[PDB]
Amino acid sequence: ALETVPKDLRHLRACLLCSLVKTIDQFEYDGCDNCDAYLQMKGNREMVYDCTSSSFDGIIAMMSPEDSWVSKWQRVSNFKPGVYAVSVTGRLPQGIVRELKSRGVAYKSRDTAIKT
Amino acid sequence: DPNLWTVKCKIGEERATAISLMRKFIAYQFTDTPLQIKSVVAPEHVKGYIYVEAYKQTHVKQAIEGVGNLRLGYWNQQMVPIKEMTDVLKVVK
Amino acid sequence: VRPAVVMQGSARNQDDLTHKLADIVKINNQLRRNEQNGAAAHVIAEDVKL
Ligand SMILES: [Zn+2]
């Protein structure tokens, strides 16, 4: 969906749960295309800031997750087409991790960077 | 599984070029000339080219046709060695 | 062996060997940083070729 594509290069953020990359304004207007059913950040800039990070490294433009090795490596093959980060710095708040777990949504860190 | 190919890109325009390529794919996805590439990666510190995942180089050429930033990458794309294929997504810190 | 003589004006002109060693040191430093930090080794390859 075109609405999913980042509208510009300013104030990009990456979802800490799925690594989808969009602008802060796009997260506010539409939420996360993948996680918004669970995170419900649409209409709440603070929730967007809680679930997304401005510190990320690299991006991956994933269009056909069902026919890509990259999507398997990145564990995004079940998500919607969109722009994703290679690595995301940060962690979801403990409360959000706990609620996800209580709702059957497991959280695996999207920080893939080799640290030292 | 498809392969990855390097494509020369205007330096500093890699992210913008990837975004243009997704907009192009989305525009053409319901046409009779869809893009057959599988992904594009612009690593954080790579300068002057992008990586495109596709099964065929010809699919890469067809996808990147008309993309000004890739005009110098239109005629030749280099295959990423499979043993080095995972290095494309490594982000050391 | 590579005297930097002044041209007709005052700017110090460098020798051809100096310019070549400068290019060598540029790519050498670039490759050294690309091996000091994980650079996917593709750039490392291209760098070694250059
Ligand atoms: Zn998400």
Side-chain angles (χ1 to χ4, degrees), chain A residues 15-20 27 32-36 39 41:
Chain A
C15 182
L16 287 157
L17 185 58
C18 76
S19 78
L20 186 74
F27 282 118
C32 177
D33 297 69
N34 296 309
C35 309
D36 185 1
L39 291 178
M41 73 291 291

Side-chain angles (χ1 to χ4, degrees), chain B residues 39-93:
Chain B
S39 74
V40 289
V41 185
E44 69 180 355
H45 65 85
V46 163
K47 297 172 185 58
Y49 63 91
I50 301 169
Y51 296 85
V52 63
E53 189 178 37
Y55 283 104
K56 295 182 178 180
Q57 196 176 342
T58 61
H59 298 165
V60 178
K61 177 176 195 179
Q62 291 168 0
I64 66 173
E65 190 191 341
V67 180
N69 288 340
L70 303 177
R71 67 194 307 282
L72 305 188
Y74 185 61
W75 296 126
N76 290 299
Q77 306 82 41
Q78 294 194 328
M79 61 79 71
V80 176
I82 298 177
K83 287 177 193 177
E84 158 187 18
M85 173 297 307
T86 61
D87 291 334
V88 174
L89 296 168
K90 181 168 65 64
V91 178
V92 291
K93 288 302 174 183

Side-chain angles (χ1 to χ4, degrees), chain B residues 2-4 10-11 18 20 24 33 35 64 74 81:
Chain B
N3 290 94
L4 283 163
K10 189 167 185 175
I11 194 166
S20 187
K24 189 181 181 175
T33 62
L35 274 64
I64 66 173
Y74 185 61

